[PDB]
């Protein structure tokens, strides 16, 4: 944590968790986009691994691999509707552009 | 640091710094690629700002904004030649894909 | 996590948790010793706060305030017997002396 | 950096550096106080090692071992006079007591 969710993102995640009928909560992750690039990833979690770090915002369990925490700290997960596009959006004060 | 450069990257950076004729060294940075994405950035530096953190690998000064250090720690800057493509490549043990 | 417990520490903590009859697990914390000093602190936890980060080693829930994580990462909690003294001991590879 | 010096601390350090007649600046470090304890350390630096991270506040070069940066980030070095006592004092918002 110092990872936060906006109302709409928590709502969206809770919506997903409710329709599914099970699950511990939300996984934030990170992967290479290619060569000089990082991509954020979202997944459902049923079970935290022993490698995982677990925390809470707006009553949503967020699971983050311990090794990925350096990249994700300070992240605000938002859910936005822009034009014909609707989906999750990651923000950092520390980062820019 | 715990940011490292490979021989070829240091060489490449030193090559760039030599042909240019001036410069303090190398800036590692980070920017949003879009929505759920981070892009690594490389720039020349003539002057560290007071916000900057400075360190050394293979006698190359690396300058990193203090706020970007969470994302870049553990980074190995390499320089690779693959097919018709030649350029810088960022690696992290912590990250994957 | 990247916070670990030795066998004896986990045993000791589980022993404590068993005799007590309840509790979520273990809190690792940090406080000022005075002027130029930090002291590690151990406490029982019944409830993770929303500020807390939770993780696992040897089936012991470790709770760490999100703000204290910078100081505690890489910590090995051990439990040692030395002479007439027996108690918890904190180690870091990164740190020395 | 995100390590800062107060006016009095920078003054004090610069005073020390001036009377000495040489030196690159200031080393912030960390050592074990004993068992469950950390102590902050201050030293002069003439030469940053390749392991070191260098930054600036109030035109004072602060040198911090890369491995010690997790413990020192967010530190405010102050210099205070309290009673018959006068000396350096380390603060963190993140930490308490």
UniProtKB/Swiss-Prot annotation, chains A, B, C, D:
- Which GO terms are recorded in the biological process aspect for this UniProt protein? iron-sulfur cluster assembly
**Signal peptide (from-to):** none
Essential cofactor(s): Fe cation
What keyword terms does UniProt attach to this protein?
Iron, Metal-binding
Positions binding Fe cation in this chain are 35
- Per its UniProt record, what InterPro entries does this chain match? Fe-S_cluster_asmbl/transfer, FeS_biogenesis, FeS_cluster_insertion, FeS_cluster_insertion_CS, HesB-like_dom_sf, IscA_proteobacteria
The GO cellular component terms are: cytoplasm; cytosol; iron-sulfur cluster transfer complex
Domain of life of the organism in this record?
Bacteria
Induction of expression = Repressed by IscR.
Respond yes or no to whether keyword rRNA-binding is given for this record.
no
- Which GO molecular function terms does the record list? 2 iron, 2 sulfur cluster binding; ferrous iron binding; iron chaperone activity
Q: Which Pfam families match?
A: Fe-S_biosyn
Q: How is the cofactor bound?
A: Binds 2 iron ions per dimer. The dimer may bind additional iron ions.
Quaternary form?
Answer: Homodimer; may form tetramers and higher multimers.
State any further remark: 2 iron atoms may bind between dimers.
UniProt family annotation: Belongs to the HesB/IscA family.
NCBIfam families in the cross-refs: iron-sulfur cluster assembly accessory protein (TIGR00049), IscA (TIGR02011), PRK09502.1 (NF007049)
**Role:** Is able to transfer iron-sulfur clusters to apo-ferredoxin. Multiple cycles of [2Fe2S] cluster formation and transfer are observed, suggesting that IscA acts catalytically. Recruits intracellular free iron so as to provide iron for the assembly of transient iron-sulfur cluster in IscU in the presence of IscS, L-cysteine and the thioredoxin reductase system TrxA/TrxB.
Q: What is this protein called?
A: Iron-binding protein IscA
Q: Supply the source organism for this entry.
A: Escherichia coli (strain K12)
